[PDB]
Amino acid sequence: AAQTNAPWGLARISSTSPGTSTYYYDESAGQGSCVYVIDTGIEASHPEFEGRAQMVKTYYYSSRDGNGHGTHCAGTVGSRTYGVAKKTQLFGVKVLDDNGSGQYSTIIAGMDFVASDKNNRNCPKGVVASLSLGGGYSSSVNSAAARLQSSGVMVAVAAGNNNADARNYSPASEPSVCTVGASDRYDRRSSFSNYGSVLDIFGPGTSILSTWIGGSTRSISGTSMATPHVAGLAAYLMTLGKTTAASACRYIADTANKGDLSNIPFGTVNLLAYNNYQA
Ligand SMILES: [Ca+2]
Ligand SMILES: [Hg+2]
Ligand SMILES: [Hg+2]
Numbered sequence: 001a002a003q004t005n006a007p008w009g010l011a012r013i014s015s016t017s018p019g020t021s022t023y024y025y026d027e028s029a030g031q032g033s034c035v036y037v038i039d040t041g042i043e044a045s046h047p048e049f050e051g052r053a054q055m056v057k058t059y060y061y062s063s064r065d066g067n068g069h070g071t072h073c074a075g076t077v078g079s080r081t082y083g084v085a086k087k088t089q090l091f092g093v094k095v096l097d098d099n100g101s102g103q104y105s106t107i108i109a110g111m112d113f114v115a116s117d118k119n120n121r122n123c124p125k126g127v128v129a130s131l132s133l134g135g136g137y138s139s140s141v142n143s144a145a146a147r148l149q150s151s152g153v154m155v156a157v158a159a160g161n162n163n164a165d166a167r168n169y170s171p172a173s174e175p176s177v178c179t180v181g182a183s184d185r186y187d188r189r190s191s192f193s194n195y196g197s198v199l200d201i202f203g204p205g206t207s208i209l210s211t212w213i214g215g216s217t218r219s220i221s222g223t224s225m226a227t228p229h230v231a232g233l234a235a236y237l238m239t240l241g242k243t244t245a246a247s248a249c250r251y252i253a254d255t256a257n258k259g260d261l262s263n264i265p266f267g268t269v270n271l272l273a274y275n276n277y278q279a
Contacts, residue, residue, distance in 0.1 A: 001027045007082055008185050009204030009229055014275050016257060018187045024277045026240060030085025032125030033235040035077050036114045036153075037228075038107075039070030039132060040100060042092035046071065048079040048211050049090065057113055058094035059106045066098035068213040072220060073132050075211030076228035077235070082210040082217075084232025085239075089123065096133060104141055107133065111144040115151040126238035126245050130231035131157040131171060132224035138170040145171035154238070154245040156180055156231040158223035160194035167196055178234075178249035182206060182226040183272060189263040193223055196268060200249050202261060203229035203273045233273050 003010065006023035014024040043065050044053040053074060055063040065071045070092065078088035095110035096102040111129075118127045129148055134157065135141075149155045155177040160169040166181075167173050172194065179198050182190030182205025189195065190206045205226030212218035234248045243251035256271035264270045 001025050007209040009208055010084065012204050013084065013229060013233065013273055014277050016274070018185065024279065025236070025275065026277060028239050029087035030078060030232070030235040030239050031087035032123070032239045033085065033128065034089045034091060034121055034123035035085070035128040035130060035231055035235050036091045036093055037070060037074045037077065037130050038093045038095050038110050038114065039073050040067035040096040040098065041065035041070045041094040042074045042090060043071045043213050044092065046211050046215055048075060048081060050080055052078065052088065053090040053092065055092045055094070056117060057110070059110065060094060060097055063094055065213055067096065067100050068218070069100060069132070069220070069224065070096065071213050072210045072218060073130060073224065073228045076208060076225065077130060077232045079211050084229055085235040088235045102133070104135070104138055108141060108144040111148045114153065115148050118153060126154065126235070127152065128154040128156065128231050128235050130228050131155065132227045134158055134160050134169050134172050136170065137168050137173055141170040142174040145174040146176045149176050152245050154178070154234045154248045156227050156234065158227045159199050161192040161222050161224070162194055163192050164194050165196040166194040166198045169194065173198055178230060180223060180227045180230045182223045183261055187260050187262060189261055190221070190223070195265050199268055201230060201253050201256060201269065201271050201273055202226065230273055233275060236275065
């Protein structure tokens with residue numbers, strides 16, 4: 001299939017070269033897989049989700065996304081127009097408050113929750129978890145991510161927006177998970193993107209158009225925007241049977257666009273998510 005005039009990030013992900021505008025992809029579009037979006041929540045009622053989204057857990061008074069970025073993230077994962085895996089199932093887990101904040105304790109609980117909950121869902125093709133959040137190093141937060149990963153869920157997490165080494169950030173510093181850095185339209189590392197040996201891959205994260213609360217759309221930037229591209233790509237490949245939850249991150253890196261990025265400091269991988277689609 002082909003999506004003309006797609007958002008830059010989607011096109012990038014299906015091209016060996018920057019500057020294209022069509023998103024090529026397999027019609028299967030991730031049907032059969034499930035992506036948990038651990039964020040501020042999801043405006044499930046957004047027409048872009050086509051009823052493929054559901055809230056399954058909140059740690060606050062309401063299950064609603066009063067922030068928007070959670071909706072944005074989910075959109076990049078599997079919205080009709082803005083998503084990578086256009087036919088995936090989305091489950092929102094509200095660990096962050098309407099201000100976009102959350103306590104380590106809550107975030108951990110949210111991870112333990114997905115590990116369990118997945119057992120009651122029908123996701124024949126696999127389970128993914130997308131975590132566009134983080135903070136200062138914590139061994140417990142890291143540990144929670146590792147458990148989730150070991151439970152059979154493909155865990156994708158943002159590298160952080162400090163323009164620093166991701167080693168001092170959690171759950172970014174957890175080696176067993178998939179740490180995602182940001183890239184811009186010109187194949188440059190995103191100015192704010194964290195880097196370091198702990199990163200596994202880069203995805204598009206500068207000026208990302210996607211869904212927003214109130215049934216609208218919005219373009220924002222961050223390693224937070226890149227993460228969902230990877231989570232989406234993972235769901236997509238899983239339904240294709242190319243890879244499993246345990247080896248997805250490595251499969252993505254193996255098959256990535258190599259050496260295309262600029263502004264990549266020595267010691268950081270130079271790999272860009274790539275779907276390798278061939279009509
Ligand atoms: Ca890793
Ligand atoms: Hg987000
Ligand atoms: Hg987002």
